[PDB]
């Protein structure tokens with residue numbers, strides 16, 4: 001089903017701030033090579049793409065890529081099948097896809113000088129970090145080691161080059177500024193649903209606590225758990241006795257309580273072990289991270305919330321990676337998202 | 350005017366290579382913080398988006414953004430009007446838009462370490478360059494000085510922030526590797542037309558000399574001229590009698606001659622001075638750059654080519670900036686592109 005009918009489509013920039021260099025700009029002086037002298041730079045803005053169907057029904061969806069990714073992951077799968085953008089426009093929702101600040105078409109804040117440095121001010125760090133193909137292979141649970149696939153795999157095998165090419169580094173933009181850009185987008189759109197992934201999971205939870213217009217969250221394989229400040233439960237170290245999961249984010253209770261006012265679903269794929277796995281770090285990391293999320297959702301529910309954990313295997317879908325929305329069964333995964341939206345009337349006007 | 354019916358849409362990655370860190374990857378050891386140890390990194394790949402109409406007519410168009418830009422500039426104008434992507438899908442062409450290596454969703458090659466450095470190897474430079482808002486204002490001929498508009502300007506005033514937010518730095522990826530990615534795309538697509546802009550002007554000319562599938566070129570405000578090796582004509586310095594335009598690119602004559610085999614049109618906007626303008630560097634830069642391009646097109650025509658220069662004011666369009674395809678009269682600019690495609694049979698199957 002590749003055909004799609006759009007009432008309108010487009011893109012725009014939103015959010016960000018400006019920083020300035022010293023001095024004055026003289027238009028009679030050579031403009032190239034570029035100088036910081038008299039310069040204004042727009043930094044930390046976000047790119048937003050939208051596609052609206054004819055006669056939309058229900059709330060617009062905001063798809064928010066995971067760490068080191070872009071909106072591409074919602075456009076197409078690595079093997080070229082339709083992504084969630086097409087599927088949900090066909091499902092009669094207006095769809096927004098973002099490249100957050102620091103990723104893709106979002107701004108990378110750098111100037112004339114060492115990366116990230118504007119004269120004596122460090123806007124972002126010059127030293128970067130970035131996963132390897134091998135790190136991403138195990139992070140995303142294609143298999144326990146690079147080159148290997150779990151038996152039930154839904155990964156589009158043969159398209160590894162396409163898949164890994166979509167990933168890259170993120171400069172050290174503050175998470176506050178990333179959240180700020182999405183809050184501004186939510187203010188612009190009106191009532192909407194956030195659909196997050198991995199690194200954007202915790203960021204979307206934060207956005208919802210700052211933006212009443214977020215009426216629901218579906219988070220695919222969120223990477224960092226969230227708790228009320230001072231109320232982080234005991235979370236065990238990993239099976240190597242030395243590593244820990246990502247430090248849970250803590251927010252004041254008055255903000256955490258806002259998460260109890262909207263439906264929230266966390267979705268996990270397959271091959272997360274039930275028991276400690278010392279031989280495979282990322283598998284064990286996922287075990288304990290999923291556990292921490294279960295406690296986070298329980299925390300939301302004890303405050304009167306509507307938070308749930310959906311393990312795709314319990315719904316009859318086996319072999320999903322940590323990107324279930326680009327796996328070979330992504331249509332079925334989408335069907336479960338449509339089910340969530342319908343249950344809560346988010347597919348109704 | 351905003352409606353579009355797509356037989357299919359999507360995006361993919363193409364081109365690039367890999368580089369490897371030292372050592373070995375052990376999945377039992379902590380994967381985060383990320384390490385170069387045992388790492389394979391995909392670098393210099395390009396992002397490609399396509400939208401295909403029902404019943405396409407003629408050749409697909411490949412829209413190639415200018416320096417420091419992304420495919421956003423073909424999606425929408427800064428004030429939210431349809432870009433050339435929508436207009437030409439409506440004109441029944443399949444439309445490709447790219448983010449070239451080093452820009453937007455294309456790869457930015459950096460690792461774990463100082464920006465661009467993989468251990469002892471510099472893949473791209475740690476020191477970046479980037480235009481300011483002020484430099485881009487005069488580069489794009491919004492007016493003679495930052496914050497000032499030409500009276501006749503077609504720029505979408507009031508949307509200055511949105512416009513400048515779309516611009517950013519480019520890492521020092523070799524032009525050879527950028528051309529290589531587009532050659533690979535052209536091989537994948539088949540016969541097509543390149544539509545280029547500013548910095549991508551010279552790169553599209555190079556692609557055509559390596560790819561018979563390029564059946565025509567329309568270049569908006571190209572930034573660097575091209576000539577046969579050893580046959581660069583005399584080009585004057587700027588009015589300051591100190592500065593020069595960008596050094597013309599020189600290619601072997603056997604490759605240059607391929608440019609005579611396809612229709613080529615260079616398109617310029619308004620407010621390029623006829624006479625030396627020492628007070629306004631970029632205005633004077635455009636005067637001499639346009640002159641150099643006129644000589645380049647003449648050299649192609651002396652080899653039997655069909656290379657033309659279209660000044661938009663001679664077609665009745667006044668006030669265009671160096672981004673005519675996002676200006677307020679971009680529908681009229683698009684009409685002139687359709688005219689070029691129709692005259693040369695590029696809108697026929």
Ligand SMILES: COC(=O)c1sccc1S(=O)(=O)NC(=O)Nc1nc(C)nc(OC)n1
Pocket residue numbers: 066067068139140175197198199200221223224246247322
């Ligand atoms: C898409 O990939 C994933 O399935 C996972 S799993 C763990 C991480 C990822 S990720 O999205 O690539 N990046 C991150 O989440 N990185 C990250 N981000 C923040 C804000 N804090 C910290 O703490 C150290 N790490």
Ligand SMILES: COC(=O)c1sccc1S(=O)(=O)NC(=O)Nc1nc(C)nc(OC)n1
Pocket residue numbers: 032033034415416417418478488489546547548549570572573595671
């Ligand atoms: C989008 O803007 C333009 O209408 C123009 S005019 C001159 C350039 C542009 S561009 O596209 O932005 N390129 C760049 O600014 N890139 C660049 N920058 C330097 C410092 N040298 C070189 O030489 C090859 N190219």
